[PDB]
Ligand binder design. Structure first.
Ligand SMILES: Nc1ncnc2c1ncn2[C@@H]1O[C@H](COP(=O)(O)O)[C@@H](O)[C@H]1O
Ligand SMILES: Nc1ncnc2c1ncn2[C@@H]1O[C@H](COP(=O)(O)O)[C@@H](O)[C@H]1O
Ligand SMILES: NC(=O)C[C@H](N)C(=O)O
Ligand SMILES: NC(=O)C[C@H](N)C(=O)O
Ligand SMILES: [Mg+2]
Lengths: 285, 294
């Protein structure tokens, strides 16, 4: 699509839904006493998940992969409960152009001081359930009805369906995948990862991801080294961890476009974006 | 300052005010039928921010995306016009901007990363947008008195001054701001190609806060005609090459008359808490000319 074709698409309904979704979600969090933060796009540190880079007054800065580390820093500042509509940049290859990836997207990213994994899962369930009932009033269609979703261990997913891909295809209710070996910020205890991904049914895939966090220096540094990452990619973060100023917390990020896609029923996520950002295809506009 | 000093700052109060402000402003627009758009951070094209009396002529940060040069968002002005061209009628976005300005703009009012609530309205005129902004601001200030217990400017409408008369009378909008005790409008400012110009009159407006706090909002009616637009780009010595896909859309006759504005969120928060320096309202300061540690 050239520039003129991009702007000649019909996208009014998807944007209408998006507006209702953003209004609903931001209110859900402010009603529960969350502080509303603004995002940052450039920092010496970002989610390790190679991040694009740019020089800023002579210093190399990474474009934000995600704000996970900054959420932990906000908790360390004593903000208690925070969320942000955070734009992310993730330059995946043509292979990830599967209808559910975009190389620029926003997540509603939130964190809570002292929360446990079941608290956050329950909180997301409350949000999704309320939202699905509204989506029925908005679009005169029917959505998944469960108040709580089934919980699968990552290994049970691999065993029964082979992949989270096949899992999503087979299901008709959202479902959780838990205990997923991941990054250094996710808390691991007794070989169990205290983390969680909410998966949508009908092949739509992941919509939310989160976990309890590591806050202890030695444990964090061990997992970084263990993964073969350079500790100096996280220097200022590790200095706050060393000062013992990280606090226990838990949170998650919700993919806004993925949620909008599900509620509108769009085949490709590009259809709900006024300016598509398709993996492997540099945007025309 | 260093990481531990930053996280040690006390800014709970500013963030609490910010939360109430964001809640208030987004509701203001959704209540009025505006569509809520998500931001874009990377694009082949962005706001030149030039000509502009308020700028020094910075170049956008750039990064390759699949081998192709992309500019980090200076502002979403061109994208706002494209949204109007897609028929969305009334739109807003909480748009982050990256503007790598020099130490000379570290005046307490600038940060090199910030968010503006950026909005646009098909068919609107400058008086319409200015009146909408006054409505938003008046109502915000009334709520702020309850949130803070302090008093705020009570004006329901603000006085209007020509840019040219500001320069002759005060010497600068900075000095004008120091002398005023209520918000005020400065209009008719020769600047970027996208603001509408008719017979030497620019159909644009800046809202200036009192007490030296300076500009908090900027907007204008827009150009939509290809030939008019291209002529202005050429006369400023900018390159058509820098706006290629946008000019394609203009050439096809698909831009529509519209007007809008951007409102500085952090600048507004700073005003309401009475912060000396905008960095005091940001969990992660972005001081012009100084690379942030986090
Ligand atoms: N529109 C999106 N494009 C790419 N990644 C996304 C998008 N929305 C959310 N994500 C993130 O993608 C990750 C999941 O990877 P994947 O299994 O490939 O779906 C999570 O960290 C999500 O936060
Ligand atoms: N460097 C900055 N730091 C904080 N806010 C800014 C900055 N630049 C612009 N703004 C805000 O964004 C609005 C629109 O941007 P602009 O018209 O480009 O100057 C301004 O009226 C300010 O409220
Ligand atoms: N990159 C991610 O998806 C991380 C996720 N938002 C979290 O809070 O853990
Ligand atoms: N200069 C800018 O940031 C553009 C402004 N947001 C407008 O609507 O005119
Ligand atoms: Mg301005």
């Amino acid at each position: 699509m050239n520039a003129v074709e991009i702007i000649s698409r019909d996208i009014y309904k998807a944007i209408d839904i998006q507006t209702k979704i953003l209004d609903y979600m931001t209110k859900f969090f402010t009603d529960r006493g969350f502080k509303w933060l603004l995002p940052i796009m450039l920092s010496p540190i970002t989610d390790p998940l190679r991040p694009a880079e740019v020089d800023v007054y002579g210093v190399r800065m990474r474009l934000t992969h995600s704000m996970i580390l900054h959420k932990q820093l906000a908790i360390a500042m004593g903000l208690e409960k925070i969320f942000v509509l955070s734009p992310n940049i993730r330059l995946e290859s043509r292979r990830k152009d599967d209808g559910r990836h975009s190389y620029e997207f926003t997540q509603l990213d939130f964190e809570i001081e002292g929360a446990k994994m079941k608290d956050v899962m329950r909180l997301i369930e409350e949000l999704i359930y309320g939202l699905f009932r509204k989506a029925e009033e908005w679009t005169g269609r029917e959505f998944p009805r469960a108040r709580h979703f089934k919980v699968y261990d990552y290994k049970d997913i691999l065993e029964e369906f082979g992949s989270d891909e096949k899992a999503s295809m087979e299901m008709e209710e959202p479902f959780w995948i838990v205990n997923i070996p991941r990054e250094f910020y996710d808390r691991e205890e007794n070989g169990v990862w205290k983390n969680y991904d909410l998966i949508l049914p009908y092949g739509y895939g992941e919509v939310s991801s989160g976990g309890e966090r590591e806050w202890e220096y030695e444990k964090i540094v061990a997992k970084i080294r263990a993964a073969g990452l350079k500790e100096d990619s996280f220097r200022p973060y590790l200095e706050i961890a060393r000062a013992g100023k990280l606090k226990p917390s838990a949170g998650a990020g919700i993919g806004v476009e993925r949620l909008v896609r599900f509620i509108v029923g769009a085949k490709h996520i590009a259809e709900v974006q006024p300016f598509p950002r398709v993996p492997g295809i540099p945007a025309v506009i």
